[PDB]
Design an enzyme around this catalytic site. Structure first.
Site, PDB file in Angstrom:
ATOM      1  N   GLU A 736     -15.243   6.616 -12.342  1.00 15.04           N
ATOM      2  CA  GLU A 736     -16.281   6.835 -13.381  1.00 15.04           C
ATOM      3  C   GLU A 736     -15.276   7.517 -14.454  1.00 15.04           C
ATOM      4  O   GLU A 736     -14.185   8.727 -15.029  1.00 15.04           O
ATOM      5  CB  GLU A 736     -16.786   7.870 -12.452  1.00 15.04           C
ATOM      6  CG  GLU A 736     -18.202   8.381 -13.723  1.00 15.04           C
ATOM      7  CD  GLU A 736     -18.925   9.119 -14.723  1.00 15.04           C
ATOM      8  OE1 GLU A 736     -18.727  10.321 -14.279  1.00 15.04           O
ATOM      9  OE2 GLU A 736     -18.368   8.790 -15.727  1.00 15.04           O
ATOM     10  N   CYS A 770     -19.460  13.405 -19.897  1.00 17.19           N
ATOM     11  CA  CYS A 770     -19.474  11.580 -19.561  1.00 17.19           C
ATOM     12  C   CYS A 770     -21.091  11.394 -20.367  1.00 17.19           C
ATOM     13  O   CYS A 770     -20.671   9.894 -21.060  1.00 17.19           O
ATOM     14  CB  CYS A 770     -18.949  11.263 -18.887  1.00 17.19           C
ATOM     15  SG  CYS A 770     -17.541  11.975 -17.668  1.00 17.19           S
TER      16      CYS A 770
END
Ligand SMILES: Cc1cc2nc3c(=O)[nH]c(=O)nc-3n(C[C@H](O)[C@H](O)[C@H](O)COP(=O)(O)OP(=O)(O)OC[C@H]3O[C@@H](n4cnc5c(N)ncnc54)[C@H](O)[C@@H]3O)c2cc1C
Lengths: 981, 978
Positions: A736, A770
């Site tokens: 990720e 994020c």
């Protein structure tokens, strides 16, 4: 009881005489247009949804094009529309509906219409319509409107004759009541009202409420403090109690209490006891409550106890029970009965007679513009009736209209049943306690698997609770008694100290050293890999249900330490209280969810249906997983990646971030408390320059789970692709890698929602997510209005240490992040133009201002590069096509949001705004396990979604065993065989 | 007729009366066998344990094997039924002797004479393990010759059985005293209707040798009937042998009334005998293979050839017996049945037709249905016992078949003698039973589509399927010499670099010329796929699935044509070629259904005020790099999976199967697939291989081939180049070094042909092929003798000739590589077998078997991809497992074992992607065996399974706050308060 039945007979007969004296409210007059629109809404729930959402969006339909297109998208073409149904037919009818419920659009008009109502025999309590207060300036505008209203009323009330009464002061209404009576919504006085900062919210609201109240007292008027959603109930009670004690002898101050709250029996008892203790008098406007659907939804979304009763008759019964309690206490508590329900009104009237309550201790209130026959009947029977009369701008007047349409057309509405459904009068005037018992008995007459409860997300911290509010200062203090430790490696069940120590400090106060972290060299990392490899065969052969049990035990271990684990995150990485608690609850959710997923996936399944054959399909682990974890979600994502690898039968070598290694140690504590076998989890913090490539390159590593920067993730992917000598497998990557996430603000967006959601999406945890919003893409014709409100709300927030709940955001993670973010801010201020740059505290701490920069275009660096800090780029799109094009103009595809009430634009966004998690009409952060499995493709990841039903498969490989079951021409018949019977 | 039926029922009632309550020994609960079968019949789990134990018993040749298997099948002493070690061995051996007339020829002859003294005739059969070689066929043949020579010397001294008239030297006045039965496929180890003429001749030549000896002593030869696979072969053997000896009366054939074909087959055979003016004899049976035929047909989507209501076989028997009896002038009749209703029916029909007694007799199996046998002796007088003799190892397998027969739920014997079934029901006209049962009888798909089923395999029991391959191969040869261009964005693109494609079994035969793409054309194809991708991605998943369904129907309509091309272009045998095309069809049908299943967004979570929908997105342009060894199947599987999930494909077929690759162009164009979604770019890897893998607009690479190339692709694809949108997704299958373990207790009759086919099918050119056979010490010498002897019977030659087992390998480069590996292996171990190959042109490699191979040897580790089999001798089962796991691969594996402990250990520790128990380790089918492994065999993607399509997509979630102004619609799965 016998007595209960005799009084009920009096109430029912009063309700019967009430109905006999009345004819329908105008909203239920199906000759008029609004009566036709509501009649079809009550027959067709699909049309109700369309019509009510249309009225809500209607004030934003400010051009001919917006209006025409929304009409078609909501209602179809002229063929599919109802009989009573364009740009003129709806606009004049909707505006006329909204004026039914408001006493004017200006103060001068309101005062003139309030005087007309007096000559019709009605008192009033005046309320000021407003869009949500999102700034200090907006709170001042709202405050000064009440001050303006009071000044206008001050000059007129001397000329008003008091409404006629049975005796007393002919200058007062009915001989006793103040002629000027206003109601104020407390949260409209402070845009950051929030029980997370309970004291700050009470003081900010009280200071404005006091300014209004002083003007009220100069008029010898009445001030009622309205009650809003459950989130602010305790705040509002405390405002009332403080203001009351400041003016302990002034009698004309009221508070609303909501009978639909389970808390209200106790809250009313408490307030009555409090008034007795302080030797003051009070006034209560008892209502059922205005937020029922919202409270039920919000509690269910957060695994909180639903604060409202959920059988409608329970609210009716609570009202009659609580009205009796007030009337019993009439010497201390003046009563305003606020209901349109004839049963409820009749019950109050008879209880007042039973208790011989003087008439100057109770009055009746209804909302302006509805239940007119009930209103006329109260006037004729009781004589003391006050209309709640809002006034102001048509934009919040439209939202008010929606709420009134919802109230009148609800399935359970007493008005709808009486005047639309032709309900039986006996059932309508029934003692609601009888209705309760019947509904409960009928109800008395989602499942899990394998004896385990179904998955549910762990409950969020609930700052409506005094104990939750007190827990964080307590546990931060308790954590500060245990600082200064040296944290060792943990390898094969043993603590291993090394001579290389890195301190970990408080980012909001770097002089506060929380501990020292031993660093693993390549030798220690190799030992950890060896220990994981040696533990792997027996762990792989451990029953999946047994492996899952370890995760359930670790989840209960964390659940018991929830506030303690949260407090560590407040200090070690600068999480705000809610942000810290949500990190721990997410860790708990991963454990509970991945345990259940492995149980689901752990049994071999027969595939194919051919007889004489059995094929079983099942999964195998890979071996040793390197887990390289981020600092920004230091327990959640660490535990998610590690526990997923562990429960699927792999063994883990875990490198926590060098600035959240104490949180990393919590994984050691939790797995040790769960009794996990030695070597299955190994804790090796270390310097990436020393052991980073070593860990990723090692031939005994079969999987790498990584969450972090694109640059590091891509480098890991490149290196891991090589198969080294002795390497058993192609290395599996679970990665990720962050985002450059946009929220689109469409022309028709609800800015009261969009502004606070964008602010939180951009600056929650100072933008270190994020998922954070780093681009807000705003349609051309709403740009100036949106950025004015966004910047004004930003100016109300404070930057400072995260342990102090008054601060919105605080210092960033460490000195490196601060330097890098500051460089990006200077780059951005040369690309665009600064709209807001917050103050920061003087002195130590890695503070970066809350920064908003406008004029940004897709070509700009801060429109493309992930800054991971409190820097928001505002981009001005010329039309919706360009908004989508700009949303899609980066290398990333992680999260995104859109505020829009256009079915066509939302459909286009669902199709084309191809982020891994798209959010509609809410913030684009805060994904929950199972509800929002999280992760993206493009440069944001490899398409693995933590917290979802595809994730565990990535840690395993499938296997099939096929058996020919035939011997000497016979095979056992199996249940799912394709056979000939 | 109702009056005839009443006579039959009364005849049956007298029969049951004359039995006096006697039970056959198998139903005598006073004896051990009766107790064992009683418990087997009450407890299905014990039946499975006991019958499988009797099957494995003859391989339990040491004390340890025996003790361990007893414990594994039956538990400890306390866990066993009361009637239950040395006691077990002797009781099972005694059971087997019950059904066998002797172990030696001399003993059999002596016991046949005792049978005559008790009034019984005999038909003698020779027990044998499956014939797996020419030597074993000769042993079986010579055993009949030895038996007949012994009977020749004895029969003159036998008084003929008493009759009512005729010849006092013959049994009952008319039947020859010596009567033998032969199983045709025991005469040829490669009997297979795929080589119909070769099988008929080989069987016929040995049957003729036996028949000549039979005629020399004026005996009777009966040709038994075996499974449906060989039924037409055996009929043709009988017809030919009849016409060679048209005047010799004593030749019979078995016909099975449980076959739907038998009404026509009986009619055809009678008409054939009338046409040729010969007489025949038919032993009418119901049939011995019912469970097998039902299972085998269901496993191949063939029509079940047997009736599946038991009364239908009974009704067919009475109908066909009437037909035979009516034709007694031409057809002698052996009624072979233990069913009192069936027997009574034959007796009364023969009486009503006044059939001469010399035209019909009755037969039962030796050692069973004893009261039935005695009742026939009493009422009819002409009763013949089918009497096997020989070695106890095949005797045990025969015993299991008899135990299965006697204890079946539908068995007339079980119903009469174990279940106390009502006599009136037992003796009912089975035609009435059929009607009642058919009346009582009077898997779903999704969205109007039928459920997934594998496409039916070619069926060489059919004359039309046998004729189709030569016709379609000849048609293909009218289509040679074409130039095959690239296919990009719906247009043909020609280049001037042409590579011929030739027949590997005849390289002088040029099939065509293939244009090669340079980097320019590959770049153009990538650009076309990228331009087609947005509208293709936005196409509804059900509509994308429809193109796959149309492509599958297009392929189904061209099945033999597409197969014939593979015979010539890459040397597929007929069955291998057809199976390649049916697998391509399966991928299309399966992935279409999978996309329909995965294409609907699903609500996830249950919180109100909120809708989360989870669904999948395609990636973009997929490079598909396909192998030559499954040139339509795997090409179509990888390409259609990428396409149906919404990606667009640039497809590189193998340079030696590019015509087969052009079939994807034909199929997708016939389906109407939009331009640019599928692009065909054969090219030289040295020109454009890295270019295709490296290109920034590629998002996914689907590869099947060598480990070296796959690992190179993985390495190069991990880099993110400027302008590259995604991290490249790898779907990779990279071959194996697959072992089959042969345990001490393996059934070698099964293991040997399955290992041969696993190693040498399609001359070993399969990633799944068995290249290592790991054999337990104590069975090594016997296993390799039978495997080598079977291998010696097979022929190497062109695949268009169905007589050949395998043929040439893929090209000159493969031939040289494999031959070099064979030489390396011959220096590591010791050659056991090296076949002849044809002289002259062709890329022939001998079928090669090398023994003495150890895990340290190169040919125990490196994938050869050719007909070279390493045999490894393991000292114990632990070492066998350790050796199976000693390579860097983990793709397929097999084990032949009948030990629950060893199978469990293999299931857990023999960690290949596809483990096969007691069958070949090749031939995975879509959905039944999703295929693929990890380690160095792949990245854990399994084509043909329910996890595969997700690898071509990425998941996506849309979350909507549905609350406006304090209200939200209530949705069906909301957690709410009602
Ligand atoms: C001397 C002799 C020689 C034989 N030779 C051969 C041979 O060369 N080849 C061969 O195939 N068989 C041969 N058989 C027949 C076979 O071995 C069985 O003995 C015979 O089928 C049993 O039939 P039945 O009339 O004794 O018993 P029953 O209990 O009446 O009939 C059982 C039979 O019905 C059939 N059946 C069972 N279930 C079903 C169902 N659900 N649907 C439809 N049909 C069903 C099967 O054929 C089964 O064997 C021979 C039998 C004898 C006595």
């Amino acid at each position: 009881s016998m007595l209960n039945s005799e009084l009920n007979t009096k109430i029912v007969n009063r309700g019967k005489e009430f109905f006999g004296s009345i004819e329908k409210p105008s909203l239920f007059n199906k000759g008029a247009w609004m009566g036709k629109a509501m009649d079809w809404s009550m027959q067709n729930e699909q049309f109700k949804i369309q019509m009510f959402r249309f009225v809500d969006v209607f004030p934003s339909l400010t051009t001919s094009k917006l209006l025409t297109e929304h009409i078609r998208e909501y209602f179809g073409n002229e063929q599919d529309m109802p009989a009573f149904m364009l740009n003129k037919v709806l606009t004049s009818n909707i505006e006329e509906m909204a004026r039914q419920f408001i006493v004017g659009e200006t103060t001068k008009e309101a005062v003139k219409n309030l005087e007309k109502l007096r000559k019709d025999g009605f008192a009033a309590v005046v309320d000021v319509l407003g869009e949500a207060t999102l700034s200090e300036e907006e709170a001042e505008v709202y405050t000064n409107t009440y001050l303006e209203l009071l000044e206008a009323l001050k000059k007129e009330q001397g000329s008003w004759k008091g409404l006629p009464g049975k005796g007393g002061d002919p200058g007062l209404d009915w001989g006793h009541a103040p002629k000027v009576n206003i109601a104020v919504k407390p949260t409209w006085l402070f845009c950051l009202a929030n029980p997370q900062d309970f004291e700050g919210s009470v003081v900010a609201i009280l200071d404005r409420m006091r300014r209004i109240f002083k003007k009220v007292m100069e008029l010898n008027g009445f001030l009622c403090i309205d009650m809003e959603s459950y989130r602010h109930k305790e705040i509002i009670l405390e405002v009332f109690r403080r203001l009351k004690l400041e003016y302990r002898d002034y009698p004309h101050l009221g508070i609303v209490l909501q009978a639909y709250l389970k808390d209200n029996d106790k809250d009313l008892d408490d307030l009555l006891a409090w008034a007795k203790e302080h030797k003051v008098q009070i006034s209560v406007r008892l209502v059922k409550g205005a937020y029922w659907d919202y409270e039920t939804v919000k509690a269910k979304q957060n695994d909180w106890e639903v604060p409202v009763w959920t059988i409608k008759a329970e609210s009716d019964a609570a009202y009659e029970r609580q009205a009796r309690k007030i009337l019993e206490n009439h010497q201390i508590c003046h009563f305003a009965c606020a209901s349109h329900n004839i049963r409820t009104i009749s019950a109050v009237m008879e209880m007042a007679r039973e208790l011989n309550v003087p008439e100057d201790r109770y009055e009746f209130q209804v909302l302006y513009g509805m239940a007119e026959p009930v209103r006329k009947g109260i006037l004729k029977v009781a004589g003391r009736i006050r209309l709640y009369a809002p006034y102001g701008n048509m934009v919040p007047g439209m939202g008010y209209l929606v709420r009134r349409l919802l109230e009148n057309t609800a399935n359970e509405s007493f008005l709808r049943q009486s005047f639309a459904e032709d309900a039986q009068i006996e059932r309508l005037l029934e003692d609601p306690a009888v209705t309760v018992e019947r509904e409960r008995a009928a109800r008395a007459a989602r499942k899990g698997l394998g004896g385990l409860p179904p998955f549910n997300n762990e409950a969020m911290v609930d700052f409506t609770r005094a104990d939750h509010r007190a827990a964080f200062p307590k546990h931060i203090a308790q954590v500060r008694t245990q600082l200064g430790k040296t944290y060792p490696l943990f390898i094969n069940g043993k603590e291993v100290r090394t001579n290389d120590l890195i301190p970990t400090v408080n980012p909001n106060k770097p002089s506060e050293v929380l501990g020292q972290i031993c660093q693993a060299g390549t030798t220690e990392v190799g030992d950890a890999i060896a220990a994981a490899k040696a533990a792997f065969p027996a762990w792989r052969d451990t029953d999946p249900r047994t492996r899952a049990e370890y995760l359930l035990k670790a989840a209960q271990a964390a659940r018991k330490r929830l506030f303690e684990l949260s407090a560590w995150q407040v200090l070690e990485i600068g999480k705000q209280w809610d942000q810290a608690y949500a990190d721990v609850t997410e860790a708990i959710d991963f454990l509970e969810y991945y345990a259940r997923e492995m149980i689901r996936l752990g049994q071999p399944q027969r595939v194919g249906h051919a007889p004489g054959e059995l094929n079983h399909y099942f999964y195998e682990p890979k071996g040793v997983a390197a887990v390289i974890a981020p600092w920004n979600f230091p327990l959640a994502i660490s535990m998610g990646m590690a526990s997923a690898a562990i429960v699927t039968g792999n063994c883990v070598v875990f490198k926590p971030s060098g600035i959240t290694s104490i949180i990393g140690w919590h994984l050691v504590e939790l797995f040790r408390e769960a009794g996990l076998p030695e070597g299955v989890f190994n804790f090796t913090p270390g310097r990436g320059s020393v052991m980073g490539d070593y860990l990723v390159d090692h031939p005994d590593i079969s999987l790498i789970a990584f969450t972090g920067s694109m640059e590091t993730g891509l480098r890991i992917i490149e290196r891991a692709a090589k198969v080294h000598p002795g390497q058993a497998n192609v290395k599996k990557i679970i990665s990720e890698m962050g985002g450059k996430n946009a929220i689109i603000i469409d022309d028709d967006a609800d800015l009261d929602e969009a502004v606070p959601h964008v602010l939180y999406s951009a600056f929650g945890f100072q933008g270190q997510k994020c998922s954070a919003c780093s681009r807000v893409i705003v349609l051309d014709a709403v740009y100036d209005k949106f950025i004015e409100r966004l910047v004004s709300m930003a100016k109300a927030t404070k930057v400072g240490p995260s342990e102090d709940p008054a601060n919105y955001m605080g210092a960033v993670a460490d000195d490196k992040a601060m330097k890098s973010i500051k460089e990006y801010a200077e780059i951005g201020k040369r690309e665009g133009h600064v709209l807001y740059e917050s103050p920061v505290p003087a002195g130590e701490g890695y503070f970066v201002p809350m920064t908003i920069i406008g004029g940004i275009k897709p070509e700009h660096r801060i429109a493309q590069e992930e800054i991971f800090g409190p820097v928001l780029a505002v981009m001005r799109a010329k039309d919706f096509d360009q908004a989508i094009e700009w949303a899609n103009s980066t290398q990333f595809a992680l999260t995104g949001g859109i505020f829009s009430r256009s079915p066509e634009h939302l459909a286009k966004a669902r199709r084309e705004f191809r982020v891994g998690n798209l959010y509609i009409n809410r913030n684009n952060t805060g994904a929950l396990v199972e509800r929002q499995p999280f992760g993206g493709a493009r440069m944001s990841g490899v398409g693995t979604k933590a917290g979802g039903p595809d994730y565990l498969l990535h840690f395993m490989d499938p296997r099939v065993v096929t058996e020919n079951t035939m011997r000497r021409g016979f095979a056992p018949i199996e249940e799912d065989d394709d056979w000939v019977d």
